[PDB]
Amino acid sequence: HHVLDKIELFILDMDGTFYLDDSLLPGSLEFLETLKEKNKRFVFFTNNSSLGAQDYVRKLRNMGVDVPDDAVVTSGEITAEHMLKRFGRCRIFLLGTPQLKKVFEAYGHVIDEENPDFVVLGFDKTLTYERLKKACILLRKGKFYIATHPDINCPSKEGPVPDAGSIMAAIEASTGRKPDLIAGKPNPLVVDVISEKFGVPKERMAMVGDRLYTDVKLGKNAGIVSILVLTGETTPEDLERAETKPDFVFKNLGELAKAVQ
Ligand SMILES: [Cl-]
Numbered sequence: 001h002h003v004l005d006k007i008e009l010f011i012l013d014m015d016g017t018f019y020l021d022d023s024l025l026p027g028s029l030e031f032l033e034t035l036k037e038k039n040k041r042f043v044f045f046t047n048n049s050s051l052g053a054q055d056y057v058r059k060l061r062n063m064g065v066d067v068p069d070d071a072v073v074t075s076g077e078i079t080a081e082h083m084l085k086r087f088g089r090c091r092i093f094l095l096g097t098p099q100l101k102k103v104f105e106a107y108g109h110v111i112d113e114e115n116p117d118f119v120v121l122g123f124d125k126t127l128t129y130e131r132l133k134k135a136c137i138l139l140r141k142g143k144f145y146i147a148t149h150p151d152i153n154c155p156s157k158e159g160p161v162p163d164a165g166s167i168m169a170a171i172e173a174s175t176g177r178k179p180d181l182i183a184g185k186p187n188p189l190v191v192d193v194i195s196e197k198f199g200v201p202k203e204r205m206a207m208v209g210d211r212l213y214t215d216v217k218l219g220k221n222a223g224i225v226s227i228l229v230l231t232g233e234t235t236p237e238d239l240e241r242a243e244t245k246p247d248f249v250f251k252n253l254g255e256l257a258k259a260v261q
Pocket residue numbers: 001002
């Protein structure tokens with residue numbers, strides 16, 4: 001034998017894996033209960049930088065999942081922390097929501113649209129033309145260019161909606177530049193960070209999610225086990241079509257839980 005017994009830390013997708021819309025999925029609670037009993041650990045991760053980790057902590061709590069503050073990580077905190085680590089406190093032009101802006105400021109970065117050294121692109125649900133224009137002008141001056149994550153679209157109640165990667169396509173068409181760094185899944189940085197933060201070797205970690213391409217690729221890139229659940233973006237028919245398969249497939253977190261009980 002039982003290979004999954006060795007996993008000490010599970011990185012979990014949120015919407016589509018732990019809950020769907022505003023409702024918890026079958027076995028989600030059971031799964032956390034099991035982890036607690038077995039002295040194992042989890043952390044939620046999302047590429048979705050339109051909100052901060054605390055907004056998602058709040059969302060979970062409001063569904064009756066009591067989690068500590070450090071239970072969620074997003075591409076926003078990964079990006080802000082990586083910049084802080086490698087470059088110190090940075091002057092940035094940010095294409096991001098007010099929530100993402102607080103994330104960068106919490107890491108001691110400063111928004112300076114006049115004299116930035118970085119252009120930083122997130123899931124900017126507050127994008128305007130003028131802001132796109134300014135970003136392009138700066139990119140043409142050769143500013144260092146960072147995106148929180150690559151995703152072209154984001155799943156939604158209304159179907160696939162443009163995400164950071166769609167904005168990237170506009171920027172690239174206008175300036176000819178792609179980001180110098182894209183921090184989020186499937187960049188293995190995410191895993192390295194979490195691994196160092198909680199002191200767990202990659203060999204005792206797994207990625208559990210519903211994003212066939214991204215989550216599997218994160219596992220390959222990072223060298224950790226990928227477990228796909230069937231509750232979200234991925235169907236059995238998608239799995240059959242997939243060029244690269246996950247390490248394990250489970251109906252949902254409740255069935256995964258039974259695998260490790
Ligand atoms: Cl066996």
